[PDB]
Amino acid sequence: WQGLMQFTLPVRLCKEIELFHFDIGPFENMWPGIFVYMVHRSCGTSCFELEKLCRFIMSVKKNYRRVPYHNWKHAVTVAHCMYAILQNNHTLFTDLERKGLLIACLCHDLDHRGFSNSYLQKFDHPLAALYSTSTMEQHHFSQTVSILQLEGHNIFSTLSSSEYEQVLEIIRKAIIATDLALYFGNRKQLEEMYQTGSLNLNNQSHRDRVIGLMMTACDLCSVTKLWPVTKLTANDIYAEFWAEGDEMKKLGIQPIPMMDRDKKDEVPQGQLGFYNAVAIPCYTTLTQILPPTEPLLKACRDNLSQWEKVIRGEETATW
Ligand SMILES: Cc1cc(C)n2c(Br)c(CSc3nc4ccccc4[nH]3)nc2n1
Ligand SMILES: [Mg+2]
Ligand SMILES: [Zn+2]
């Protein structure tokens, strides 16, 4: 925490970090510092007490598990995408939203066990008893509130009780929105609002939907990196999915192909299906609403053409 307070971002990165395609991968020692940097530039140096923010960040890190994908790296990656959207669309948002959203993104997968909502609900895990829908996401929000209530961690203590209640609702809605089950309906409504010219960012119901799609766009942003980085991250995603598949075999339940390591051949077509059904529509709608986010769409389209290249047998060396 102390070290973090003395972190300065190297000047070469100060330019690169503002770009959507920025990959945090090669800077692991600087991830906590990169988050403080992004909060300071977007929100401001006075949004949070520096000691409480650093204490908060280090507890958030401790409370992500050593799972192949839903880990600390993912949290900082999703926060960086949100940083880039906010910097590109700064004055469409309030200080409270900028605060809420950077924090929501860092916390949105807190205490992830590497198990899907399907697993927990099929195996009637206690979390699924509590949280009937959006099971892990309700848990991630609960974990965020637990961390905020730690001694020295309440980064929102400069707020009124009203504003505290407001920022918790921004965060609740933002984390819940990362349930991909909710994405399909959210994007369909946004697409209709946009095509019919009814979308109004000063309409709070519209604004909540736009924020939800920003949360999907940031959660999925590995598909917006340069091909080699996207391809490396896909390996982590499958490491985790296949471990769930293995855990189901043990328990006498057979898994869906995506979670079955003995169906690895179906990955390229699986990705094609994921890009067509989820990622391309997501970034397509976000770019309509927030034209500065276009680079995410262009990058997503580039990676789709790369998966097509893999499918027709034309890819290059792996390492
Ligand atoms: C960044 C990201 C996020 C999500 C949610 N991803 C998913 Br889901 C996938 C995998 S799509 C897929 N379908 C398959 C069918 C059979 C075998 C393998 C398959 N992979 N990638 C994601 N990336
Ligand atoms: Mg999640
Ligand atoms: Zn996530």
From Swiss-Prot:
A divalent metal cation 1 binds at residues 74, 108-109, 219. It comes from the Eukaryota. The active site is at residue 70. 3',5'-cyclic AMP binds at residues 70, 271. Abundant in the putamen and caudate nucleus regions of brain and testis, moderately expressed in the thyroid gland, pituitary gland, thalamus and cerebellum. Coiled coil: none annotated. 3',5'-cyclic GMP binds at residues 70, 271. It is found in: Cytoplasm, Cytosol. A divalent metal cation 2 binds at residue 109. Changing residue 109 to A: Loss of activity and of zinc binding. Residues 1-314 form the PDEase domain. It is linked to Dyskinesia, limb and orofacial, infantile-onset: An autosomal recessive, early-onset hyperkinetic movement disorder characterized by axial hypotonia, dyskinesia of the limbs and trunk, orofacial dyskinesia, drooling, and dysarthria. The severity of the hyperkinesis is variable. Striatal degeneration, autosomal dominant 2: An autosomal dominant disorder characterized by striatal degeneration and dysfunction of basal ganglia, resulting in hyperkinesis. Plays a role in signal transduction by regulating the intracellular concentration of cyclic nucleotides. Can hydrolyze both cAMP and cGMP, but has higher affinity for cAMP and is more efficient with cAMP as substrate. May play a critical role in regulating cAMP and cGMP levels in the striatum, a region of the brain that contributes to the control of movement and cognition. Belongs to the cyclic nucleotide phosphodiesterase family. The tandem GAF domains bind cAMP, and regulate enzyme activity. The binding of cAMP stimulates enzyme activity. Composed of a C-terminal catalytic domain containing two divalent metal sites and an N-terminal regulatory domain which contains one cyclic nucleotide-binding region. Homodimer. This is cAMP and cAMP-inhibited cGMP 3',5'-cyclic phosphodiesterase 10A. The chain holds residues 722 to 1040 of 1055 of the full protein.
